[PDB]
Design a protein around this ligand. Structure first.
Ligand SMILES: Nc1ncnc2c1ncn2[C@@H]1O[C@H](COP(=O)(O)OP(=O)(O)OP(=O)(O)O)[C@@H](O)[C@H]1O
Ligand SMILES: Nc1ncnc2c1ncn2[C@@H]1O[C@H](COP(=O)(O)OP(=O)(O)O)[C@@H](O)[C@H]1O
Ligand SMILES: [Mg+2]
Ligand SMILES: [Mg+2]
Lengths: 505, 460, 173, 51, 85, 171, 49, 85, 115
């Protein structure tokens, strides 16, 4: 059973000598080694240490190489021999690692045997060119009513979830991942500097509430070396860039791009590189810029010339949702302002709405989406235009609501409706909502079916309406979940459904 | 035999040169006679040909260039086990209580790797505490990490002495107290308190006070973990109390530049996040056993944005933010209910009535905060009646969060109160539902259960 | 490390010795300067803060058996820059530079036991075909090799030991 | 629960398989150290010196 | 250990002539050019505040008289200047 | 013992440190400014009678010796976030804050309650003072809250009114 | 199933102790191509137990 | 030439210092004659350990009503006086 | 004939060493055969001893420590005039569009004095 396979491993062996460059470790400190030798070292090459650890050749100085250790470093010593591999950093890619949890090197930490990757990709790659890229005009439904109505996400867009601590940034991202269980959009969650028990709690939620089969989990815990944290997101992008170049849509979430920036700062300062504004290195913009501009939608010519004529009429994409943490809501800090310039829309999650219990605590007016309504499906586009105006009018008329009454009934109506649409756009954490369910709930608000129900029952009203609609008119829900189409016949049918439901509870 | 010589002594940092064969590896210990005093050095860097740069685990005074150094080929190793119970030790695990030898069976190295991702164990076994505000706003499970954040003088120590009283005495498992950078008087007062209460036989104490050279304050936290990890690997449930996580990072800052490192954002070391991570990822509950830990976190200048408190916020299951405002107003414990939270505050894992009460309380207090400056400038008469109502209920809720502690009796001259979790929910729900709207604010201040609020209301 | 400050002086000396056809003399002159620079009293004179002119006279006088062009200047200019501890590195720099111009490689071979001098001559001619230099083998008898040989050719190496293959197979398992 | 037990099966197999691998190669090292002759060292080297 | 402005051809000239005064004290050679600041070698008869005449009709103003080099600022377009002028 | 200006010591140590070329930290102070003041202040202590008897080789028995310290710090414009104030505030057993506003208003000594604390507290008082002083500590802190909150209400509840007057009396 | 896989590993361990006798002599000649000495099979059983 | 006296800085200490103005090195500056010290002591020493302490239960009276009522000081405490100029 | 060698690579900063007669002027452009591609460097500073410090006008990954560098005598020169209309170009004046080669008659340097 076992040992005939070990015999086979004895058979699969190489007995002849081969030749390479060899270096000597001069110094070891804080995860950085200085290597004398390696005249053939090159920028970004992998150096093989004893113990099957790699280092990355970062500084090439005139007489020494500065390399960062990707692992436990403390047992390395002066005078050890390090061999030069010739490889720029590669990671496994494929469907075989779809559904598993790996580290930055792509080795599985799952504990569930080895990978069946189809091949390897370079962690560093250039983004698709200007002419190779196509306009974003397909939806990614996040399943939250507020985001999908006001701040729509399209297949290829790069939205930013920016907020303070403990405001639901992770909750929103993983709910986005969970809603992809049945779309063709594969999903990737990159956990940078998260603590391992938090990651484990998330992964268990992903299997329990739905499917971890469609998600690749990349992990670099806070105990691992800064080199592994820094690179992690690029390794995840190489795994998502595999699907993009094959013709299939994908969605990658990068959790704390601020922690990646911190890791790069540590590496840069230990390599003595000149400091900038917050001690961050000069190229800290060129870190996130070159990371996020790989998230793209790509035309059929490119995907047909990449695959060499296997898919023919497809257009691949890779949507990105980076997550950033501001400190006391400072939006002018260096890393936040870089990322806000690089991305195209942000979902700003304000903290005092979250403390107020309006979860998810999205803040309209400061949260925008630069791709516009070309990413929305048509029914969600028709039923959401007024919502933005109604909330804008509620912002200004909220000041009056605090202390005053016996205003004009025009205003009174407008304010009330604002306060109840605000009440409508909140939902429980692990309940995602399909387009038909969101649609009809927005229609109920927009056509005024709530205007007499403008009281605390709105939560019960929505739950009852969703149950009733499922009980009686599910072929409409199938037709809307298929098409997202809207017309006079749909408008009338939605009226008929709402008119009937009011007669019930 | 001795094998190295001292070549530099700049402040607390000592450089030793060795033969280019058998240079000491990183984190090893070394030994030198500082006169009659045996001095330990810890290796921090292998730099250049044959040289190592090191930190003194003791005073650097009295060292000469050219002294002989002997390399111990292991890290700093400390006694671990039952023999550590009831004994005060220093960072090196030497007794400082004058009761004699430790008598240890086994010794363990203080530098070890954290548990692997597949070893971690999930728990939601909620602990109950007497403290109303904490059990309402930030309940925490057995096996979780709790952090008490505050600036100077807000109640971190008094809270931790109360939590030690309430949790540890019911706990039948062994406990560790790590006094990182503690005041020597407070360490003596704690030792005597435990000795009188007769709970000293189940606590091991490691103390590294403020007066000690930076290496001691740097490494004493790891000796605390190494003892707690021995108990966890025996399979016990352990309570670990750490007096300040901040003065570990600060002990790193002091020596970082002399180690040649380029400075970072607020003068901190470049390795602040890794130094915090490597320590805090060992404090976990595995499948074999559970560590439950309560940490106090100093907040420099009372700004929660400073890198040091800012990073440690991301490691903790519950975070009880104390605030200087509430302490200055004289409400004790000074917990901010809006900033503090727990990941165990879920309707699924707490009772759904608990969750609804918590959401109500937070919503009300947030609604008070925005009204505060409006009343201050434009006056209370320019509120409306439903706001005048919610501002009253807000004041009643903000009084009922206060509580007398048995360990904060010496300061105030009053008995100490323990409230059960159920009574806390029942009271705050009653206040929000207005069943006590007619009682004055002082009828809720410094009281136990709401039955005691009506008894004191009767006396009022 | 002094290698970087050695490089300008080692290049200036090596560039100069070929202008005057005395590389072979310069090499032993520098090996001399490297041996005296190790002396325990000379290192105290070097650390002793004399002014460079009088220190230069205090070194040039003690090393008088050197040409005017060679000794009295290289030692003085390195002494003004305080580089004289670089001299053991200036030596190796000089040698390497020579081996470069002379198209030579100081190949090392390592083995558990002596080679048959047919094995070794084959190794020479084959390394001279692998490289493009006249090789100069030197062997080492290391018992950990157990069998086979290691060939090290500067920064490049060629492992033929059984121990390396044994530990490679132990990881193929 | 079936998938969780299958993970423990693979891990226990792998740990035994690595133990026996280490024993096998340590024995092969001793065999190499003792079973050798100069004409066999030269036979190996004559595969080497071709390159 | 930074290289204090001494470099191999200049060192070879000092090896050949241990006393530097064989060249006239009125002339020197540019040893570095960095964003407008220029660094001359030689000019033992230059004083602070002089008008050092570059090739072309350009001037540079002596600002630092160091032990072995003069530091000057170029008045005009500096990009045309090389080592060894 | 009274240390007149631990601030000017910190300044002298900074001058020595920089002239010696040690690496500067925040505000240019060396990192062992915390170690300077902490090793200095933890020397002030009370020691048990066994320590006294051991030290004096038996001459003095039955007595606990003590050293009390009162370090002084100057802050610029009341900025507590500066480096040296932060260190000393972290080391000491309490604070007395003296304020320009109170001093100009004529409250001299210009102590601000609620921003000053004693962590030894009631243990360091006579029983009479302990008893009388407990009520004062809360009364002034809550009085400043009520005095801020009710600047503009011309009429007030006499419960609150009573407190307000009493607070002005104790002030 | 955890106790099952435990006892299954215990049954395997003795049978792999037989297979690992074979592998030491097979691989130690594989690594030198030339066959190992039949005589030198002495001290191989030390590996066994 | 500098010799190295192998001794750390020590200061005159005793009862005879009460009433005397002294510089950091122990030299009187009041001009009232020499000191009457009870031997010397070392300037840089270490503090008593945890086991050697005793708790603080004795008051030291300021005499100021605000301090001694609200912010009491005991014999062994380390009170900080902070503020502006 | 290519007359310089790379001596350092630190991120995007490349340092190259030339003979003392051949040292580039300050804004000259240099070209390296990185991998199979050609990498343009723009000189920024003339350090002493024939080393010039340069910024890579492209990806720096894959550069070894001994590659030969060719010294162009002009700065970066770009196609100008009517042929550029309708075309998208990069910094170096190369088509990022796929329409084809720009039929320019003249190439001008990007650096000059104001009127
Ligand atoms: N829609 C919701 N309803 C109720 N609770 C929610 C909702 N969304 C999030 N929460 C709760 O908010 C808390 C914080 O969520 P989350 O951890 O995502 O915030 P965060 O911004 O990621 O915090 P951190 O940045 O520290 O990771 C969690 O307890 C989560 O359960
Ligand atoms: N619950 C409380 N009851 C009474 N006094 C308190 C309470 N909490 C804090 N204090 C006062 O504030 C002081 C400072 O808090 P403490 O915990 O001692 O130091 P820190 O908060 O800095 O750790 C206490 O010594 C005491 O004077
Ligand atoms: Mg979160
Ligand atoms: Mg404290």
């Amino acid at each position: 059973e076992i040992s005939e396979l070990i015999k086979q491993r004895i058979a699969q062996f190489n007995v002849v000598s081969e030749a390479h460059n060899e270096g000597t470790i001069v110094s070891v400190s804080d995860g950085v080694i200085r290597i004398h030798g390696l005249a053939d070292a090159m920028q970004g090459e992998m150096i093989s240490l004893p113990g099957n650890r790699y280092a990355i050749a970062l500084n090439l100085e005139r007489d020494s190489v500065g390399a960062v250790v990707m692992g436990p470093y403390a047992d390395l010593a002066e005078g050890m021999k390090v061999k030069a591999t010739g490889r720029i950093l590669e990671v496994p890619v494929g469907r075989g690692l779809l559904g598993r949890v790996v580290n930055t090197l792509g080795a599985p930490i799952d504990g569930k045997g080895p990978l069946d990757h189809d091949g390897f990709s370079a962690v560093e790659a250039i983004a698709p060119g200007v002419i190779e890229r196509q306009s974003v005009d397909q939806p990614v439904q996040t399943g939250y009513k507020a985001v999908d109505s006001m701040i729509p996400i399209g297949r290829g867009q790069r939205e930013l979830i920016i907020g303070d601590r403990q405001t639901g940034k992770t909750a929103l991202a993983i709910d986005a991942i969970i809603n992809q269980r049945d779309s063709g959009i594969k999903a990737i969650y990159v956990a940078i500097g998260q603590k391992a028990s938090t990651i484990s709690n998330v992964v268990r939620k992903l299997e329990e509430h739905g499917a971890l089969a469609n998600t690749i989990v990349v992990v670099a815990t806070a105990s691992e070396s800064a080199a592994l944290q820094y690179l992690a997101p690029y390794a995840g992008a190489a795994m998502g860039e595999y699907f993009r170049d094959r013709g299939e849509d994908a969605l990658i979430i990068y959790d704390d791009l601020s922690k990646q920036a911190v890791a790069y700062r540590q590496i840069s300062l230990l390599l003595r590189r000149p400091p900038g504004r917050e001690a961050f290195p000069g190229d800290v913009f060129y870190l996130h810029s070159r990371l996020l501009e790989r998230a793209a939608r790509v035309n059929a010519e490119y995907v047909e010339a990449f695959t060499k004529g296997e898919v023919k009429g497809k257009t691949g994409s890779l949507t990105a949702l980076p997550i950033i943490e501001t400190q006391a809501g400072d939006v002018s800090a260096f890393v936040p302002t870089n990322v806000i310039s690089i991305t195209d829309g942000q979902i700003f999650l304000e903290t005092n709405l979250f403390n107020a219990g309006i979860r998810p605590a999205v803040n309209p007016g400061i949260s925008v989406s630069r791709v516009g309504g070309a990413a929305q499906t048509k029914i969600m586009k028709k039923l959401s235009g007024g919502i933005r105006t109604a909330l804008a009018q509620y912002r200004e008329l909220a000041a009056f609501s605090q202390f005053a009454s016996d205003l004009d009934d025009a205003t009174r109506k407008q304010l009330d409706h604002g306060q109840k649409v605000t009440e409508l756009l909140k939902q429980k954490q692990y309940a995602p909502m399909s387009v038909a369910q969101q649609s009809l709930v927005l229609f109920a608000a927009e056509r005024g079916y709530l205007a007499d129900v403008e009281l605390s029952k709105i939560g019960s009203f929505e739950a009852a309406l969703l149950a009733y609609v499922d009980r009686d008119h599910a072929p409409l829900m199938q037709e809307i979940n298929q098409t997202g189409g809207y017309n006079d016949e749909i408008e009338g049918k939605l009226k008929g459904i709402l008119d009937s439901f009011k007669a019930t509870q | 035999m001795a094998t190295g010589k001292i070549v530099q002594v700049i402040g607390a940092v000592v450089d030793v040169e060795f033969p280019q064969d058998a240079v000491p590896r990183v984190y090893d210990a070394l030994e030198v006679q500082n006169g009659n005093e045996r001095l330990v050095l810890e290796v921090q860097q292998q730099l250049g040909g044959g040289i190592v740069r090191t930190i003194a685990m003791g005073s650097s005074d009295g060292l000469r260039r050219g002294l002989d150094v002997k390399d111990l080929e292991h890290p700093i190793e400390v006694p671990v086990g039952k023999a550590t119970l009831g004994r005060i030790m220093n960072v090196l695990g030497e007794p400082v209580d004058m009761k004699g030898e430790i008598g240890e069976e086994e010794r363990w190295a203080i530098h070890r790797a954290a548990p692997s991702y597949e070893e971690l164990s999930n728990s939601q076994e909620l602990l109950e505490t007497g403290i109303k505000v904490i059990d309402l706003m930030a309940p925490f499970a057995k096996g979780g990490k709790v952090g008490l954040f505050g600036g100077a003088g807000v109640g971190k120590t008094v809270n931790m002495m109360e939590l030690i009283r309430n949790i540890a005495i019911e706990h039948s498992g062994y406990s560790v107290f790590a006094g990182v950078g503690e005041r020597t008087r407070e360490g003596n007062d704690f030792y005597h308190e435990m000795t009188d209460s007769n709970v000293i036989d189940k606590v091991s104490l490691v103390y590294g006070q403020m007066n000690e050279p930076p290496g001691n304050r740097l490494r004493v936290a790891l000796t605390g973990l190494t003892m707690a990890e021995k108990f966890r690997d025996e399979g016990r449930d352990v309570l670990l109390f750490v007096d300040n996580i901040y003065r570990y990072t600060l002990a790193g800052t002091e020596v970082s530049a002399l180690l040649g490192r380029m400075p970072s954002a607020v003068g901190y070391q470049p390795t602040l996040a890794e130094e915090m991570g490597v320590l805090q990822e060992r404090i976990t509950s595995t499948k074999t056993g559970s560590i439950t830990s309560v940490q106090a976190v100093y907040v420099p200048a009372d700004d929660l944005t400073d890198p040091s408190p800012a990073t440690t916020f991301a490691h903790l299951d519950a975070t009880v933010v104390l605030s200087r405002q509430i302490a200055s107003l004289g409400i004790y414990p000074a917990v901010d209910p809006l900033d503090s939270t727990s990941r165990q505050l879920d309707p699924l894992v707490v009772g759904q009535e608990h969750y609804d009460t918590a959401r109500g309380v937070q919503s009300i207090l947030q609604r008070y905060q925005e009204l505060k400056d409006i009343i201050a400038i434009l006056g209370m008469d320019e509120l409306s009646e439903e706001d005048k109502l919610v501002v009253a209920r807000a004041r009643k809720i903000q009084r009922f969060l206060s509580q007398p502690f048995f360990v904060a009796e010496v300061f105030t001259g009053s008995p100490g109160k323990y409230v059960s979790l159920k009574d806390t929910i029942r009271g705050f729900k009653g206040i929000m539902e207005g069943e006590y709207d007619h009682l004055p604010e002082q009828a809720f201040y410094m009281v136990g259960s709401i039955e005691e609020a009506v008894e004191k209301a009767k006396k009022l | 490390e002094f290698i970087t400050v050695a490089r300008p002086y080692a290049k200036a000396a090596f560039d100069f010795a070929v202008e005057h056809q005395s590389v072979e003399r310069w090499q032993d002159m520098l090996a001399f300067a490297a041996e005296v620079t190790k002396n325990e009293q000379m290192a105290e004179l070097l650390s002793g803060a004399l002014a460079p002119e009088t220190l230069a006279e205090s070194f040039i006088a003690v090393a008088g058996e050197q040409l005017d062009e060679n000794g009295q200047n290289l030692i003085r200019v390195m002494a003004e820059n305080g580089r004289l501890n670089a001299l053991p590195d200036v030596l190796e720099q000089f040698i390497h530079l020579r081996a470069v111009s002379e198209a030579t490689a100081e190949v090392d071979v390592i083995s558990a036991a002596a080679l048959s001098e047919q094995q070794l001559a084959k190794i020479s001619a084959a390394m001279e075909k692998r490289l493009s230099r006249k090789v100069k083998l030197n062997a080492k008898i290391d018992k950990s090799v157990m069998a086979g040989v290691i060939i090290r050719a500067g920064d490049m190496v060629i492992d033929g030991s059984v121990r390396g293959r044994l530990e490679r197979l132990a990881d193929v398992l | 629960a079936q998938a969780e037990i299958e993970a423990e099966r693979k891990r226990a197999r792998e740990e035994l398989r690595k133990q026996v691998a280490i024993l096998a190669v340590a024995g092969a090292e001793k065999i190499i150290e003792r079973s050798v002759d100069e004409a066999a060292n030269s036979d190996i080297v004559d595969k080497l010196v071709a390159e | 250990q930074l290289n204090s402005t001494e470099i191999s051809e200049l060192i070879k000239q000092r090896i050949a002539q241990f006393n530097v005064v064989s060249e006239a004290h009125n002339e020197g050679t540019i040893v570095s050019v960095s964003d407008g600041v220029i660094r001359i070698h030689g000019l033992a008869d230059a004083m602070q505040g002089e008008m050092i005449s570059l090739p072309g009709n350009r001037y540079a103003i002596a600002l630092n008289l160091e032990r072995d080099s003069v530091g000057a600022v170029v008045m005009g377009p500096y990009a045309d200047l090389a080592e060894g002028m």
